[PDB]
Amino acid sequence: VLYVGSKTKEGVVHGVATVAEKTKEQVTNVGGAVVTGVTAVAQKTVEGAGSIAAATGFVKK
Amino acid sequence: VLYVGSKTKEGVVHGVATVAEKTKEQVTNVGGAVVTGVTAVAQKTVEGAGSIAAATGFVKK
Amino acid sequence: VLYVGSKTKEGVVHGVATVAEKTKEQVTNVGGAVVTGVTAVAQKTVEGAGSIAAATGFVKK
Amino acid sequence: VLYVGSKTKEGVVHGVATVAEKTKEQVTNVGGAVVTGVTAVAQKTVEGAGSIAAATGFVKK
Amino acid sequence: VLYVGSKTKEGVVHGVATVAEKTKEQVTNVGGAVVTGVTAVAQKTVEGAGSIAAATGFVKK
Amino acid sequence: VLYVGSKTKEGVVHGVATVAEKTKEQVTNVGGAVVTGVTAVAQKTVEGAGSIAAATGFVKK
């Protein structure tokens, strides 16, 4: 009957400073799942399953 | 019957400074899934499943 | 019966400064899925499944 | 008798990403000196005085 | 009699990512010196006095 | 008689990520010197006095 949002923040990332010095970086996947290097990510879901960095192995039935 | 949003933020990324010095970077996928280097990503879903960086292995039925 | 949005932000990315010095960068996919280097991406979905960087392996039935 | 430079860098700026969101910006000088907002500037001097952002007040003799 | 530089760097700035969100920014100088906001600046001087951001007050003699 | 530099670095700044959120920022100088906000600055001097951010008051003689 009344809802007053104001400067609300939900699922938010702000003010982020990152430095990444790497001399070498390998990934060798063989038949699975790999998720690497997720930075400054924001999400909001309404009435649904939410996943950010979800490496699922193989599914069978 | 009444809804007053104001400066609302949802699923938001802002003010992000990144530096990435890499001398070498390889990825060698063989038959799976690989997700690498996701930065400054924002999403909002209404009535649906939301995934940002989701490496799923092979699906079978 | 009443909805007053104002300076609302949803699924938004802003104010992002990135630097990427790489001397070499390879990707060698053989029969799978690979997703690399997703930056400053924003999406909003209404009544649908939303995926940003989703590397799915092979699907079978 | 011998000098072999190679990939030498002197007085150099490179690989610079900047973002500047300002809603208002004033400068009100009255009879002096003002230097504002110097970015990505490089200089090399041989046998001379070198100044990049030098606001000098009034000189008298 | 012999000098072999190689990948030498002198007075150098590189790989710099900056973000500056300011809603208001004033400067009100009255008869002096002001130096504001010097970023990513590089200089090299040989046989001379070198100054980057030098706000000198009034000089008299 | 022999000098072999290699990947030498002198007066160098690299790999720097900064974020500055300010809602208001004033400077009110009256007859002096002011130096504000010096970031990612590099200098090299040979046979000379070197100053980066030197606010000198008024000089008299």
At residue E37, φ and ψ (nearest 5 deg) are: 70, 65
CA distance linking residue D56 with residue D52, whole number of Å = 12
Tell me the shortest Cα–Cα distance from B15 to chain F, in angstroms: 7
Put simply, the answer to whether B48 touches A53 (Cβ < 8 Å) is: no
> Residue B20 CB: number of other CB atoms within 10 A?
23
- For chain A, how many residues are written? 61
| Helix/strand/coil for C8 | coil
DSSP per position, B1-61: ---B--S-EEEEEEEEEEEEEES-B----BSS-EEEEEEEEEEEEESS-EEEE--B--B--
8 Å CB contact between A11 and C11: no
8 Å CB contact between A34 and B35: yes
Structure obtained using: cryo-EM
Residue of chain E minimizing CA distance to F24: E24
8 Å CB contact between E35 and F34: yes
8 Å CB contact between B57 and B32: yes
Radius of gyration of chain E (CA): 18
CA distance linking residue D36 with residue D28, whole number of Å = 12
Residues before each break in chain B (C–N > 2.5 Å)?
Answer: none
Residues in C touching B4 (Cβ below 8 Å): 4, 6
CA distance linking residue D60 with residue D31, whole number of Å = 14
> E17 CB near a chain B CB, below 8 Å?
yes
Contacts of residue E54, defined as CB under 8 A and 6 or more positions apart, other chains included, come to: D51, D53, D54, D55, E35, F35, F51, F53, F54, F55, F56
8 Å CB contact between D44 and D14: no
Residue of chain A minimizing CA distance to C29: A29
Task: Establish, for the pair of chains D and F, how many residue pairs have beta carbons separated by less than 8 Å.
Answer: 6
DSSP per position, F1-61: ---B--S-EEEEEEEEEEEEEES-B----BSS-EEEEEEEEEEEEESS-EEEE--B--B--
> F58 CB near a chain D CB, below 8 Å?
yes
- Listed by number, the residues of chain B in 23-42 with a beta carbon closer than 8 Å to a beta carbon of chain C are 23-42
8 Å CB contact between B42 and C42: yes
Token pair of F60, please? 């008299």
Tell me the shortest Cα–Cα distance from C61 to chain E, in angstroms: 48
Which residues sit opposite F40 in a β-bridge? none
CA distance linking residue E33 with residue E53, whole number of Å = 11
CA distance linking residue D59 with residue B12, whole number of Å = 52
What resolution in angstrom units was achieved for this structure? 3.0
> D19 CB near a chain C CB, below 8 Å?
yes
